[PDB]
């Protein structure tokens, strides 16, 4: 990483994903969202996990 | 350890290699370890003349 | 988002006559300047030129 | 798409020849030539205008009789035209030689296209980079467009060259299928003037025609172009200056 | 791919001549031509809509007469079409010269296939990037499709070109080989109707047919054609709501 | 590998020619054709299965007559077949012209592979890329595979097309040198059913045969296929229960 | 970069042959040559300051006799020039042979244009990189330019070679159409002197001219050149001053 | 070698022609064939082994009669070889025509080398990808080898093909010049046994020869074959116990 | 890149053909030859010193008699020289065959020049990388040099080959048009003497001339040659003090 | 890489046809042959070491009769030798027919040089990569070396091939122009030993000669060559100690 910019974005990226997995095997907090273009980015949010 | 295959190869390359060494290192440090490596069709190649 | 998509291309022959009119105003004197012949020569130029 | 457009033999992976497409941009690097066919015969007008007055326009020719009842105009290389029109003249005469009957406009265009087709198959040859408009009157007036592809299309009014797009926009509006000689000559002049972006003078237009009730090629003389050029110019100014 | 599709003198690992099949893609991009066979003859229906209205709407044309019981429709280049159809005409008269019999549809399709294959096999020259439908009745109704490859496939209803996808699929459901002369005509019009995704007008289409009873090519004028267009149109609107 | 498959003139470093190997890949790509020889004749069966019910059930055609007792059937590009078998017929007639003897399967095979090789040698022409299984009766039944290479090989029983490997592994187990004529043609229907993996009707296979006892080529009708077709089917069903 | 300047068979998608435009720029590395047409004759002026002192006075010497009223200067490949100039003499004497008529300049230039287009269309060969000035008096004085492409252009003053751009501009000002033989002859000498950036003397030009009255080629003698040189140097001196 | 191996017109910087060296490798793809000369005749043993039991072992054969006292064997393409040897029959016959003399084996070898050499020079064509063994008796035994280049080497115990490497090794050690016809016969069966690395039977191998006392070609019937192989087997087992 | 130089059918972007431009330097790689003209005739001198003891002191020759009254020198490839001068000689003798007249010095060099022009336009062949100097007396002496393009330049004293740079500088000061035969001959030997940096020996240089009295080619034995070489050598010693 | 050794038509920037210096290397790699010119005759000595003893120890040939008074020996491809010698022998026999004169060594040399220069000049056919030595007595002894490009170089003594370099230095010292027949022969045999780095054996050399007083070609027989060898081995051994 290039430290201030990259570490923050990488950290928040993880923190999003972690949270949505861990409160739902089944509905509690249902998570909804959107993205404009999903192929301009490498998998993170487009992982089957 | 699940290693993404999308992330592998770029239009000029260096980060695609970083993730090979990284999971290699991680695997050794924590053996036994099974590195799933999808997909060997985005890094498998054939020759040309 | 930006709802009217306005082409201002390089001005027309008439549209160039009017640009010279804007100039003439702040210019002092001219009576033999033929604005049209000026436009004709200056085919495909914009206000800046 | 590199290498499938660097040959003539080679179809694109998309299928279509893009070499022939490129020989069709070569038309457009010529100068506009417009023909408009009327109920009374068929009129061919052409841009006789040239880059300096060192060149005399009159001699620069743009517009040739091919028989005595068929004329054709070119757009594309001057160079390729010389051969094609000497082919076309030979072919009309070859028709009159073994039948004794003056050629059908359709048939001249066809035979021209067939010649061109052969020069667009083989890999050791460059296809004819020009196009002709074939306009005559056999028994009925016809006004053909030969293409450097080797294809033929009949029209009621058409252009070739750089002015191709505008002239279409003009006749979509103002052509009618009931026009006289007189209306057609005015409309053919107006359409050209928009293309070159300039008011006409007979020293920069060439006009030749073939009438139904005559069937002999004639060229509208500089003298006799004048009454039409007054009327055409007034409309050309009205459009190109709002 | 690369290189196995950029030359005429290769073969791919698959074993396809992609050079030939991209001249089959040149047919494929414009336009629908339909053949529909019946027990009363064979009917060859074809588009006659090309471009804007400045081109004439009752010529140019896909259906060339080839003999007095043979017609073909074309799809693909107008440059290949003229030379090939002239050749087909010649080949029809070669069987007449030397045997003095009317040519048969089978033999003609065999000849024009060999014509095309000769160019395929040789390198340094492309094959004709056109397809035809060869429709005729000698003493047996026949409908054939001749390929830009130099191949021969017999049909009883087909379409080539842009309309191929829609008209195969229409005829998958509708067709039965027990049509009448009329029943085949409307059904083939209905089929071309869907292909351009509009209601058909007699003034942008042409129909040819070769009858069992008479055993002539007869060329269907816009006037006779129009009745059948009225019968199809009701069908066509129903299936463009579906 | 690239550049040892961009020409037919270029031998590869291995001594293989990958072009010619890719022309054999062309033969596997196509439809199947199986040849079976027995002591009383040599029976030749070919897939008559169609892409749609829009194609005439007999698509012209899968078994040609070449001589009076010589047939061949086809697998690979159907385009190449047209010219290649045409040439084969003229040659079988030429030997009747110049010696007044029916040609022998060796020598017809020989002419055709020599003709093949000439266009493998040249780089200005690409060879035929179709394999034919030429069958006939000379003094004994003979069955030959003419390869796209230009090689002949004689077989006791054989296959080509997509089903090739399947029918080589099959006849290794079953084929014996005792098989009857009727049981031979049946054994080749079983083979045929294995390749496509669907049962046979007489409407998706075409059988001709060559009899010693007649010493003539004969074409088996669907009507006279019907008993053989059922018999073979019992066995085809059992192979698809394995 | 592109295959478009790498073949002569390929039109660019810009619709230009770059090979022809690099043949074009083969002319400009030849030494200057200027033509002046007057109503009283037609005048070709050509460098003869070419070479060292180890090179003859009369070293090329461009204004070769083509006929008995026709001379032609050249710029470009001195090699390719000789064959075109030779072919010009034969074509002219052919005109004399087959008709017994004096060679029309216009038709001779046409006939060079067609000959040069055989080498343009074909790709196994290359079109000459020479521009010739075809001039003579057939019935009225005429001056044309024939291009590397083999395109017909009418000029009344022009230049070819390295001196070209300077001389085009000079005649756009100076050239007139109310022009006498002596004045013309003086005027074009003026123009040559700008090209070579230096004063003339009658030992570094050859001037040929074709009179109307006489109707013959004649070379001007050095002694005869001299007064024309003297008059011309007055303006050269003024215009190479600022 | 990397770009100097894409044609035959090239020489490589090694002084070698890699396109001809790749053609020599074509020969090792095919099987071994061995010739021996002894003082009583010359001996030709060809491999006739089938790769599948559905073949007939009488067409993978190498031995071809060329004259009544010259035979030859082959390795390389099958295809090329049959045309190469149909030529060698014609050359041999052509000598008998004009002289009334059967061709000396030395002369015949020189002729067919010269034929193969013209296929190497031309860039329109690939060499013959074959080597031959020409074995004959003119008056006294001769055995020569052709290379795929068209070069000529006289031999006296020899092989070509894959097993060539082992047969060379074999005749290095074993072969002396004090051997009889029978004793040399056995050694060539042993040299074939080494190379396939198994025991022979006389239906997978074929022997032809030319003797000097009979001065003819004969072919060893299967009947006359068994004892030679039975002796060989005794000795082939010993090399499979090394 | 750059070049645009792998064919002659492609012009370089500079307006040159690199192919011809590398062939002009292939002359400089070749042996030197020196031409000098005087008014009592024209002497042509050629270096016959090539090799050392392994090569014969008489190596052919390099100063060939082309006609009876015409000789020429060669520089550039020995190989290209051999064929060019065969044709040249044929043409010179062919003129007398058809006219019975001496071929002009100017015109013989032209017809040599045309052969190579031919090789500049066809792509199937390379231009010859050779320069002949054409020396004779038609009835006044003339000296020309022929160029790899087929370019023709009239000289009066010249060098070609290795000595190209050297002799031009040397003749700037030295050369004049009133040197005598003897002063000029001697001046020619010095000039080769600077080229090679060495004193000459009459045994390894060959000199011919055509004088004006005779108008017939003659050749100078090494015995006659001695005094000239002697006078020459003093000045060569003077050069090689610097 | 280069692209100048892609083909012959392509010169390098170095003013060299790069592909013909690579045909030159073709000579070097092959086995050696030496011609030694004296005034008592000419000697020709050439390889027979080649292969082992599985070859004929009297393998044919390096020493070709061309006429009965002219012989030649070769290095390079002996494929290219086989055709080149066929043409040489015929070329010489033509001279005898149409003049009834033995051809001279030198005149022969020019004709074969011209033959080689045909393939050198053309681009669609590769040059020969073979050198020729032509040694004869026509009426004085004469010796040439013919280069692969068709160039003519006359030698005092020469070798070509592998051993060239060893010979060049050896003959540089000892060889004289005033040698005996006996001396020159023994010495070139000393030289031939050094070339292959071993003692001679008369089975590893083939030796021919043309004598001045005989005017005939004769090949020295192995045991008639043996005393010469026997006095030559002494020297070879002496010089291989060091």
Swiss-Prot record, chain C:
Binding, ATP: 23
Disulfide pairings: none
Localisation: Cytoplasm
Domain of life: Archaea
Function according to Swiss-Prot or TrEMBL: ATPase which is responsible for recognizing, binding, unfolding and translocation of substrate proteins into the archaeal 20S proteasome core particle. Is essential for opening the gate of the 20S proteasome via an interaction with its C-terminus, thereby allowing substrate entry and access to the site of proteolysis. Thus, the C-termini of the proteasomal ATPase function like a 'key in a lock' to induce gate opening and therefore regulate proteolysis.
UniProt free text on domains: Consists of three main regions, an N-terminal coiled-coil domain that may assist in substrate recognition, an interdomain involved in PAN hexamerization, and a C-terminal ATPase domain of the AAA type.
Record family assignment: Belongs to the AAA ATPase family.
Complex formation: Homohexamer. The hexameric complex has a two-ring architecture resembling a top hat that caps the 20S proteasome core at one or both ends. Upon ATP-binding, the C-terminus of PAN interacts with the alpha-rings of the proteasome core by binding to the intersubunit pockets.
Name of this protein: Proteasome-activating nucleotidase
Source species of the chain: Archaeoglobus fulgidus (strain ATCC 49558 / DSM 4304 / JCM 9628 / NBRC 100126 / VC-16)
Full-sequence range covered: 302 to 350 of 398
UniProtKB/Swiss-Prot annotation, chains D, E, F, G, H, I, J:
Regulation (activators, inhibitors): The formation of the proteasomal ATPase PAN-20S proteasome complex, via the docking of the C-termini of PAN into the intersubunit pockets in the alpha-rings, triggers opening of the gate for substrate entry. Interconversion between the open-gate and close-gate conformations leads to a dynamic regulation of the 20S proteasome proteolysis activity.
PROSITE patterns: PROTEASOME_ALPHA_1, PROTEASOME_ALPHA_2
GO BP of this protein: proteasomal protein catabolic process; ubiquitin-dependent protein catabolic process
Keyword Cytoplasm: yes
Bilayer-spanning residue ranges: none
Molecular function as annotated in GO: threonine-type endopeptidase activity
Listed Pfam families: Proteasome (PF00227), Proteasome_A_N (PF10584)
Location relative to the cell: Cytoplasm
PANTHER family, per the entry: PROTEASOME SUBUNIT ALPHA/BETA
HAMAP family in the cross-refs: Proteasome_A_A (MF_00289_A)
Assembly mode: The 20S proteasome core is composed of 14 alpha and 14 beta subunits that assemble into four stacked heptameric rings, resulting in a barrel-shaped structure. The two inner rings, each composed of seven catalytic beta subunits, are sandwiched by two outer rings, each composed of seven alpha subunits. The catalytic chamber with the active sites is on the inside of the barrel. Has probably a gated structure, the ends of the cylinder being occluded by the N-termini of the alpha-subunits. Is likely capped at one or both ends by the proteasome regulatory ATPase, PAN.
Function of the protein: Component of the proteasome core, a large protease complex with broad specificity involved in protein degradation.
Family statement: Belongs to the peptidase T1A family.
Entry protein name: Proteasome subunit alpha
Protein's organism: Archaeoglobus fulgidus (strain ATCC 49558 / DSM 4304 / JCM 9628 / NBRC 100126 / VC-16)
Lineage: Archaea, Methanobacteriati, Methanobacteriota, Archaeoglobi, Archaeoglobales
Name of the gene encoding the protein in the UniProt record: psmA
